[PDB]
Design a protein around this nucleic acid. Structure first.
Ligand SMILES: [Ca+2]
Ligand SMILES: [Ca+2]
Ligand SMILES: [Ca+2]
Ligand SMILES: [Ca+2]
Ligand SMILES: [Ca+2]
Ligand SMILES: [Ca+2]
Ligand SMILES: [Ca+2]
Ligand SMILES: [Ca+2]
Ligand SMILES: [Ca+2]
Ligand SMILES: [Ca+2]
Ligand SMILES: [Ca+2]
Ligand SMILES: [Ca+2]
Ligand SMILES: [Ca+2]
Ligand SMILES: [Ca+2]
Ligand SMILES: [Ca+2]
Ligand SMILES: [Ca+2]
Ligand SMILES: [Cl-]
Ligand SMILES: [Cl-]
Length: 92
RNA sequence: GGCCACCUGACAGUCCUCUCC
RNA sequence: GGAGAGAGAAGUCAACCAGAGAAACACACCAACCCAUUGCACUCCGGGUUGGUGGUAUAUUACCUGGUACGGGGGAAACUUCGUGGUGGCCG
C-alpha cells in the first residue's frame, strides 16, 4: 500500500494479554522513531492485530522494512502500512 | 394429603416497548 | 444516560395481614479450557463448558414466628390443636 504514518501488524499471538502485547510492541519498535500510540484490541475482529502509529512516515517505512517476520511470541509477525491514516494523524 | 403435566396468580437484576427529564 | 409506567422470559412459591428470611433463575465481570476467527481499526462488546465473584435480589415464594377469615376435632369453662390457590393422570 502507500507509505503511511501507521503500520498494520497481524499474525500476532492471540493468547497474549493486551498490556503485555502493547508493552512488547513498544519495546521492539521504539528504536525507529517516536511512537505516538499503539492500538491493540482482542475483540473477535481485531484480535491478532495491532496498529503502531509513528510520528514520522520515514520511521514507519524503517520499521516495516526491518521487522518483517520478526519472531514474536512464537509467530513471525506480518507488517504492512495501514490502508488509511489513523485518526490522530488525520486530525492534525 | 403426595408425584407428573397443563391452569391461574405473587415476585419481575435480562430482554422488549412507550412517556418524561 | 437517569426516572418511571406497561408488556413479559427464566425460576420459585400458594387462603389473609405482618416480622424475620433464604433459594432457584436471569444478568454482569474474572480465570481456565474448548470451538470459531488471519481479521484495517481508532465509541465498548464472538460462541460453549466449569469454577469464582457481584447487586438499594438490601427482593421474596419456600422454612420459621405472630395474628385474620373460613372450616373441622378436642375443652365444663378461661379456649386449644390441625387444615387452607384451579383440573387430568398415577396414588394413598
Ligand atoms: Ca503507547
Ligand atoms: Ca474481548
Ligand atoms: Ca421533550
Ligand atoms: Ca409460567
Ligand atoms: Ca395466595
Ligand atoms: Ca415481609
Ligand atoms: Ca434478605
Ligand atoms: Ca457492565
Ligand atoms: Ca450488558
Ligand atoms: Ca486457535
Ligand atoms: Ca478470512
Ligand atoms: Ca472512524
Ligand atoms: Ca470466551
Ligand atoms: Ca465464554
Ligand atoms: Ca445479595
Ligand atoms: Ca425486608
Ligand atoms: Cl487482555
Ligand atoms: Cl488500544
Amino acid at each position: 500500500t502507500r507509505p503511511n504514518h501507521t503500520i498494520y501488524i497481524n499474525n500476532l499471538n492471540e493468547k497474549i494479554k493486551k498490556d503485555e502485547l502493547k508493552k512488547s510492541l513498544h519495546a521492539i519498535f521504539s528504536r525507529f522513531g517516536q511512537i505516538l500510540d499503539i492500538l491493540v484490541s482482542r475483540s473477535l475482529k481485531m484480535r491478532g492485530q495491532a496498529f503502531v502509529i509513528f510520528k514520522e512516515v520515514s520511521s514507519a517505512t524503517n520499521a516495516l522494512r526491518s521487522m518483517q517476520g520478526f519472531p514474536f511470541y512464537d509467530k513471525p509477525m506480518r507488517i504492512q502500512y495501514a490502508k488509511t491514516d489513523s485518526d490522530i494523524i488525520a486530525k492534525m
